[PDB]
Amino acid sequence: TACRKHELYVSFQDLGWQDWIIAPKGYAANYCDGECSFPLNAHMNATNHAIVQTLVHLMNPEYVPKPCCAPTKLNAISVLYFDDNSNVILKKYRNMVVRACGCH
Amino acid sequence: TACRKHELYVSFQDLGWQDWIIAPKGYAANYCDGECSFPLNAHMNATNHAIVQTLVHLMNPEYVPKPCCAPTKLNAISVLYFDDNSNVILKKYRNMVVRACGCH
Numbered sequence A, B: 001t002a003c004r005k006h007e008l009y010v011s012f013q014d015l016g017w018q019d020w021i022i023a024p025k026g027y028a029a030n031y032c033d034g035e036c037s038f039p040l041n042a043h044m045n046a047t048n049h050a051i052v053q054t055l056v057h058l059m060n061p062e063y064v065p066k067p068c069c070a071p072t073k074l075n076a077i078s079v080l081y082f083d084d085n086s087n088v089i090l091k092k093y094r095n096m097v098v099r100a101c102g103c104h
């Protein structure tokens, strides 16, 4: 139940890109989920702010929430698509895949 | 209800660090709160992944969650403190003050 990367597959049909695209038909976009709480490492899975916010939340849970599980590393995906002039284009889409999660 | 920066003043005395922390006696540590949903405001600086995730969540709310409202721009603060051996240390702690929030 800790802050971690979960598997998620996105087909290009879900984006309505299916008719445009040749390869791939989808990709593993993945997602960050989990409770953000101690232990926390400021050189691994948390920021200094996230450590301080966890402390404030423990003292006053009413008004300040816990930090949240978000990406630390994102990868690009390369897509091969057709255009109207029947050109074959290779486009790199940055910040598209989740590699590692952390508390922010 | 939308993702934004909320003001929060962190005083070291309520944290219980007043003895060993010389300067400052507190600081404006702010926090991120709110829903990451469409419309995604340009200030959010949402990644391509966050956009896809808010879209995937809208189709299957059951399994895939909304992306995180987290800090996009942090500031460092200098802390003057007493070491465990009574030495006076002047450390710059990075990622300490939230300047701006966003979705990822």
Ligand SMILES: *[C@@H]1O[C@H](CO)[C@@H](O[C@@H]2O[C@H](CO)[C@@H](O)[C@H](O)[C@H]2NC(C)=O)[C@H](O)[C@H]1NC(C)=O
Binding pocket: A002, A003, A004, A035, A036, A037, A038, A039, A040, A041, A044, A045, A103
């Ligand atoms: C942040 O990273 C640390 C270690 O780098 C993770 O530490 C583990 O915490 C879990 C939960 O208590 C335990 O199973 C292990 O005993 C811990 N290892 C160490 C070396 O302390 C920690 O879970 C991570 N935090 C989050 C929110 O993901």
Ligand SMILES: *[C@@H]1O[C@H](CO)[C@@H](O)[C@H](O)[C@H]1NC(C)=O
Binding pocket: B040, B041, B042, B043, B044, B045, B046, B047, B048
């Ligand atoms: C800035 O704003 C938009 C829309 O929310 C986003 O898609 C883009 O990636 C952001 N740019 C940077 C440089 O963070």
